[PDB]
Amino acid sequence: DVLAAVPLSEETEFKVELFVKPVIGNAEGTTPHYWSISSPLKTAEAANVTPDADTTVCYSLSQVAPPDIPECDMLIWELYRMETEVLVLPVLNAGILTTGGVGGIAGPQLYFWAVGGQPLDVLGLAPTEKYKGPAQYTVNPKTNGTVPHVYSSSETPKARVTNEKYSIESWVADPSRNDNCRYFGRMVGGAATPPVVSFSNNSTIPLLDENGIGILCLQGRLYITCADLLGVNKNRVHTGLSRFFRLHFRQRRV
Amino acid sequence: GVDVLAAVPLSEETEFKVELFVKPVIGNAEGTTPHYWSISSPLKTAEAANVTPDADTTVCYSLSQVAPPDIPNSECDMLIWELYRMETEVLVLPVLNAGILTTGGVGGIAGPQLYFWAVGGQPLDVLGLAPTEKYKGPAQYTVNPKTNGTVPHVYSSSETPKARVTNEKYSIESWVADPSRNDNCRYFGRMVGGAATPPVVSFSNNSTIPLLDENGIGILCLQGRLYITCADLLGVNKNRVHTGLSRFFRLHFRQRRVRN
Amino acid sequence: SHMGGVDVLAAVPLSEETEFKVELFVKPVIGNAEGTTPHYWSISSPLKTAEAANVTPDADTTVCYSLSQVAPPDIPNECDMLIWELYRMETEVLVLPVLNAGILTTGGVGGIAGPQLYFWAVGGQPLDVLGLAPTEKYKGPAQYTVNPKTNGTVPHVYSSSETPKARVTNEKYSIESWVADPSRNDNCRYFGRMVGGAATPPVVSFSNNSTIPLLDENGIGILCLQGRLYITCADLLGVNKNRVHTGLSRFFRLHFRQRRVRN
Amino acid sequence: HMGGVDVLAAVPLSEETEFKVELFVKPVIGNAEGTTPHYWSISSPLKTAEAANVTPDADTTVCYSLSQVAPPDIPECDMLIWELYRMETEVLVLPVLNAGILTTGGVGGIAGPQLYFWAVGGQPLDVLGLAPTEKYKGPAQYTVNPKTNGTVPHVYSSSETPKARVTNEKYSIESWVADPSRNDNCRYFGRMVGGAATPPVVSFSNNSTIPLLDENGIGILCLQGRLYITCADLLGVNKNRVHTGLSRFFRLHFRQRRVRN
Amino acid sequence: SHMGGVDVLAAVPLSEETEFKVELFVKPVIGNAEGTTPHYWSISSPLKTAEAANVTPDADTTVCYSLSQVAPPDIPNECDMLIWELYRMETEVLVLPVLNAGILTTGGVGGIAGPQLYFWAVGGQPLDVLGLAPTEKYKGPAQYTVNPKTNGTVPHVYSSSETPKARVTNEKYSIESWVADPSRNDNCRYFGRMVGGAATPPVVSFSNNSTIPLLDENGIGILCLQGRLYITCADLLGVNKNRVHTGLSRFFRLHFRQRRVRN
Numbered sequence A: 001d002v003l004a005a006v007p008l009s010e011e012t013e014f015k016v017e018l019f020v021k022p023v024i025g026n027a028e029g030t031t032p033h034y035w036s037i038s039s040p041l042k043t044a045e046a047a048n049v050t051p052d053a054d055t056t057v058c059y060s061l062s063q064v065a066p067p068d069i070p071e072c073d074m075l076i077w078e079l080y081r082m083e084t085e086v087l088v089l090p091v092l093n094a095g096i097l098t099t100g101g102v103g104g105i106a107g108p109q110l111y112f113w114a115v116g117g118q119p120l121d122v123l124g125l126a127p128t129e130k131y132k133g134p135a136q137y138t139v140n141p142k143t144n145g146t147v148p149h150v151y152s153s154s155e156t157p158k159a160r161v162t163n164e165k166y167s168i169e170s171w172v173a174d175p176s177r178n179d180n181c182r183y184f185g186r187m188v189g190g191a192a193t194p195p196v197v198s199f200s201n202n203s204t205i206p207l208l209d210e211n212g213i214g215i216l217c218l219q220g221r222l223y224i225t226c227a228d229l230l231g232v233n234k235n236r237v238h239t240g241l242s243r244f245f246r247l248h249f250r251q252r253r254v
Numbered sequence B: 001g002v003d004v005l006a007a008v009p010l011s012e013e014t015e016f017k018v019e020l021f022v023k024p025v026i027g028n029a030e031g032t033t034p035h036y037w038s039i040s041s042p043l044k045t046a047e048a049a050n051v052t053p054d055a056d057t058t059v060c061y062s063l064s065q066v067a068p069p070d071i072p073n074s075e076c077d078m079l080i081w082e083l084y085r086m087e088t089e090v091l092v093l094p095v096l097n098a099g100i101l102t103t104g105g106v107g108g109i110a111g112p113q114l115y116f117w118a119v120g121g122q123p124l125d126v127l128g129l130a131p132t133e134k135y136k137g138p139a140q141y142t143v144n145p146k147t148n149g150t151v152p153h154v155y156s157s158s159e160t161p162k163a164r165v166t167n168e169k170y171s172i173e174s175w176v177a178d179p180s181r182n183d184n185c186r187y188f189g190r191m192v193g194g195a196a197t198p199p200v201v202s203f204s205n206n207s208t209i210p211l212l213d214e215n216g217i218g219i220l221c222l223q224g225r226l227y228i229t230c231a232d233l234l235g236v237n238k239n240r241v242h243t244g245l246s247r248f249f250r251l252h253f254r255q256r257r258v259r260n
Numbered sequence C, E: 001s002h003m004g005g006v007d008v009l010a011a012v013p014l015s016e017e018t019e020f021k022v023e024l025f026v027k028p029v030i031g032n033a034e035g036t037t038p039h040y041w042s043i044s045s046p047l048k049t050a051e052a053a054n055v056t057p058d059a060d061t062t063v064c065y066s067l068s069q070v071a072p073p074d075i076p077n078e079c080d081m082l083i084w085e086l087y088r089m090e091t092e093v094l095v096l097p098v099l100n101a102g103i104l105t106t107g108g109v110g111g112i113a114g115p116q117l118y119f120w121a122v123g124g125q126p127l128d129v130l131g132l133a134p135t136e137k138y139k140g141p142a143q144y145t146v147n148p149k150t151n152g153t154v155p156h157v158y159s160s161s162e163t164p165k166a167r168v169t170n171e172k173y174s175i176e177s178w179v180a181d182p183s184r185n186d187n188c189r190y191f192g193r194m195v196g197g198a199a200t201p202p203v204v205s206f207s208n209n210s211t212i213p214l215l216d217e218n219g220i221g222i223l224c225l226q227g228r229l230y231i232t233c234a235d236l237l238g239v240n241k242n243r244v245h246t247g248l249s250r251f252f253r254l255h256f257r258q259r260r261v262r263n
Numbered sequence D: 001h002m003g004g005v006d007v008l009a010a011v012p013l014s015e016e017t018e019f020k021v022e023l024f025v026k027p028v029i030g031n032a033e034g035t036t037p038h039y040w041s042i043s044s045p046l047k048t049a050e051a052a053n054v055t056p057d058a059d060t061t062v063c064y065s066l067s068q069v070a071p072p073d074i075p076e077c078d079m080l081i082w083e084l085y086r087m088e089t090e091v092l093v094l095p096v097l098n099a100g101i102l103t104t105g106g107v108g109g110i111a112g113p114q115l116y117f118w119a120v121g122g123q124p125l126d127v128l129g130l131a132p133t134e135k136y137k138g139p140a141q142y143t144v145n146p147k148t149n150g151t152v153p154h155v156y157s158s159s160e161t162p163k164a165r166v167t168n169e170k171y172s173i174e175s176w177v178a179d180p181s182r183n184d185n186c187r188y189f190g191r192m193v194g195g196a197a198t199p200p201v202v203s204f205s206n207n208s209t210i211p212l213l214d215e216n217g218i219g220i221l222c223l224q225g226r227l228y229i230t231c232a233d234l235l236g237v238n239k240n241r242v243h244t245g246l247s248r249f250f251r252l253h254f255r256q257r258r259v260r261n
């Protein structure tokens, strides 16, 4: 039950800047690789069903907990405004390939970010009838099998991104669940097309819904979840170097 | 030409909401039930595909039906459910590793695309056309414009078949939405050519579609049902047809007065 | 010229008796290799090779401006004159995805791709056009089409003296040598986009919920001074398997009202 | 360039104070043996690297088209002057399909590097002379090169970057750029494209205006009685030949304006 | 940071005595294989092959951030200062079409295409940047440039401890390993777009009639706290005939006014 927002004063508002690292899976271990660049992609036979954990990208996950607050009404932190910019280099010389000429980053892309008062809700799906995912580090939809390539009430697994072990290659954001959350995604096909990426210093995102309510930190935490798959360069998967976030909080009665 | 009166002021008792997923439909080569697949069987070669592609190498319009709670009915003024607002988002994965092809490198999804959705108080009205002078369609599962022949590749008053999407057997490769018929319906489509271009697909959590026409009237469920019809052909990957994994819908209803 | 010396007065307030609506489809036109009647085809015959195509392509390997004519009901008419005025229209193109019909014998999926031309025009008279040549040797079909110069070439540039000025009165005008005249089309609204030819795909949107207003700076639509409205259009989508494709057919919903004019 | 002039009230527009002209402007290809311009939409075949990279034949390059308009004459203390406040401009263009079929087989079209540009002014367009590379000279024939038998820098130089005004049809779009530091009493507009064989996309209509008033509601002032149109529409390459727009249309809308003597 | 601990008051109402304007050009910078002075080139030396380029490309095969500095006239005449404030600017890039200079020896028209990077920044201090590596082995030129690590590699990811934080004080910063810091650039407005590398063409617009406003949420532009304004930019257009091209040069028109500040 959402009541009036506390009029914002120096005592009622909170700001944080932070960077979020991209996540590549781990071929022999359980800690995430904070890499912008993956290990070489395996060949069809392997990649099509069981790609090495370090040839896939996972949702990065970051958690923010603003200062503690000092009845029948309760005061809660509300995210109402944010800036987010991705760190990115041009690959030119690092793009020169042994054949000769300039390959670059190109191919399939996935840009996504999410802010919420809880973990991001996702759905487990398969691209094809035989894709399993890494047999190693990642939480697959089915740990040694395949889930359908279509929505199933009974068989489509419903998970929450609580760790950095969720491959963007088999987990989609759930459009039927993500309350108290704003999320945003674009994906691209794969006839070797270039990523186009803009970045500025002068660009805000408002977060208020139809009723002027932002994201409510009901449990004291805010959940950031994101991924910026840029494509492939020299048979290696590239992501954004890292993503910046400036979060603007105020207090709200509940 | 029915008689639309005032919308009932929306209260907790007069409004209705549903969330649902719609599955993509691939045709059935050895059967009559639809395949709920995001990925098809391998495409046949020119000689076959150009005239009679296997039913499981084509995409069909998905069809879903919603019937909101009964309205306990003045033998003069009726109450009708009215769809005035909706959200729709498509579920989609990036194909990277599943995109690696045997020759080496990263193929992806690319090629011809077709995005389409429709909401209505009746089935979607369509027109039967042929891409070329010899395209028949699957000789198997689908309702073809002409069951063992070809219809013209042009609009004909006499020869262009006019059907309504009442089942999941209508191939997007020979059925187009009828711009001269779809009253009490809002529909929307984009198609792409085929020099192996990538699909670009956005999805969000914060995006609405208003459905009111010039007179502020949404879609009226005159028979108590709302008809959803859609297709999201994403292109081809490794000689196989891909669609969106599934499409989400949140429907917003209110009640509206109509005269007999 | 077309609107010259016409004196436009108040629009008649629109009532059930003063307004008129029509829906219609317009068929694409491919030229005719051994005839004079138009081929209503969305798909052409196979393209000839350079030597032929570059100068004299077979009439059935080119697209012509489709032409359709609408005449609203008679008006029971002093110094004033009621006249039909087109003020609003919807137009949508019928289009299929070519996937299986796109599979080519070499293997894989060719599609429609290459040079494109989208165009439509509404007017109270035929569309005014200018005859030009893409190159120094393009003549056009020696068969069915009205060429800028029957067995020669016209310049590849605007010439006051040598650039032919015609009006699209029939379905014999090839989009490959006739351009809309920007210096003539009064009492007419027209619209065109063309694409180059490094095999790029057509992108085509269609809806149910999209209008075009037709009123000019003075709030005057298209006036049917002779009782007829002239529709002129072409939707060249590109090439698939060495064959020219167009839109299947184009839909039109025309909205008319009455308007006062001096004699 | 504009300073010194003192702009007063615009004369309220009546049938006696306003002027309109429609006109076409022809594209210009250079002349391999001659000093008159070729009014061509299509050039002669492009030379090979060794030649083209440094000294391309004059008829393998595009030059800025130039057209001049002088409205009717006008008759004490302060002057009446013609002011361009509104214009329409549309390019004439064909689809190349059959003329696009190439001897190898299939449909080549127009594709490659593009340059769209137009300018309206009360004086010639001010340009800057630059070189794409360290060895590009330009045609040794018809064109005014930045340096008639040498190269100018591939970068702005206060001392070495030549500053000219487009007074004739001899200026190659391949070595002359509009000067962003000079063009007062002028509105100009340009887009260029790179060269991995990409197609031109070109729109044309009947129902599209360009307003020309600046921040102070002042259009282009014809201080010397003439208006200067300058333009170029490089569409790309088809069958090893350079194509431009067929011709560009212009409808110019003039009114009168007061200026202190 | 750069702003925090400053107290901004009313802008001085702009009169002929309180406002200042400058026009200037900024030259592109290619690195120097043998020297320490920058090469003001729009075109680089031929790109090295993978083995070299991937880790240690020759300084003259990379682009560096151009840097330009503007210092407006001194302000004459306690408890508060007058300061110069940039509130408006125009910026346009000088660019040629490469057609004939694009013809390549194998035949046909190559052009400029491939990876692109457009960027500009205005500030009251140097632009803050972060040192990152594209890959696990990229070092940069062993010659002219300030590398993130002068003989080694820095991470390909943000590290609080290991990601170097520098300020662009000279023309020795390679756009191939230095990114603008989104967590630092107060009293600065910056803007960038990058493109991937499947040989895609640059598309570049330029006009005469296009402004950029610079006021923030509170209507405050860029404040020249030390009397200088810092311009920093780069326009990597792509590659033509195995050579790196940039914009020829970038124009700037800067609009200043005066503003009150507490000491």
Ligand SMILES: [Cl-]
Pocket (backbone or CB within 6 Å): A151, A152, A153, A154
């Ligand atoms: Cl189910």
Ligand SMILES: [Cl-]
Pocket (backbone or CB within 6 Å): B155, B156, B157, B158
């Ligand atoms: Cl018929």
Ligand SMILES: [Cl-]
Pocket (backbone or CB within 6 Å): C159, C160, C161
């Ligand atoms: Cl003449």
Ligand SMILES: [Cl-]
Pocket (backbone or CB within 6 Å): D157, D158, D159
């Ligand atoms: Cl200098």
Ligand SMILES: [Cl-]
Pocket (backbone or CB within 6 Å): E158, E159, E160, E161
């Ligand atoms: Cl850290």
Ligand code: NA
Pocket (backbone or CB within 6 Å): A198, A199, A200, A203
């Ligand atoms: Na941005």
Ligand code: NA
Pocket (backbone or CB within 6 Å): B202, B203, B204, B207
């Ligand atoms: Na969306």
Ligand code: NA
Pocket (backbone or CB within 6 Å): C205, C206, C207, C210
């Ligand atoms: Na539309």
Ligand code: NA
Pocket (backbone or CB within 6 Å): D203, D204, D205, D208
């Ligand atoms: Na236009």
Ligand code: NA
Pocket (backbone or CB within 6 Å): E205, E206, E207, E210
């Ligand atoms: Na601009």
